[PDB]
C-alpha cells in the first residue's frame, strides 16, 4: 500500500545479487566483472471506483 501522486502507473525496480572472484597479484579487476542485473515491476492505476 504505497502512495504516489500524478501518475498513470507506478514502476518498481529490482536488483539481482552478485558473485565474488579471486584476484591474482598482477590481474586487473576490469578483466573480471559481471555486473548486477536490473529489471522493473509495473503497477498501473485503474479507473475511478
Amino acid at each position: 500500500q504505497r502512495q504516489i501522486s500524478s501518475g498513470k502507473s507506478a514502476q518498481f525496480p529490482v536488483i539481482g545479487r552478485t558473485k565474488a572472484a579471486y584476484l591474482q597479484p598482477g590481474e586487473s579487476l576490469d578483466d573480471k566483472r559481471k555486473d548486477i542485473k536490473h529489471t522493473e515491476k509495473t503497477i498501473n492505476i485503474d479507473g475511478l471506483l
Binding site: 500524478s6 498513470k8 507506478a10 514502476q11 529490482v14 536488483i15 503497477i43
Partner: protein
Amino acid sequence: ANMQGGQRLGTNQGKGQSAADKLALFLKVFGGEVLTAFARTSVTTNRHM
C-alpha cells in the same frame, strides 16, 4: 447519458497518431521503494574456529 465534449487529457489525438489508447499522454512515475533481493544470512560464523 454520457457527457458531450468532455475534456480528454489522455487521448493522443494528433494529425497522424492513432489515439486509440485513452491513457497515452499520461506517463508513469517512480514507485515508492526500490525492490531488493532478500538478504542471505551466514550460518557457519560462530560454528568453527
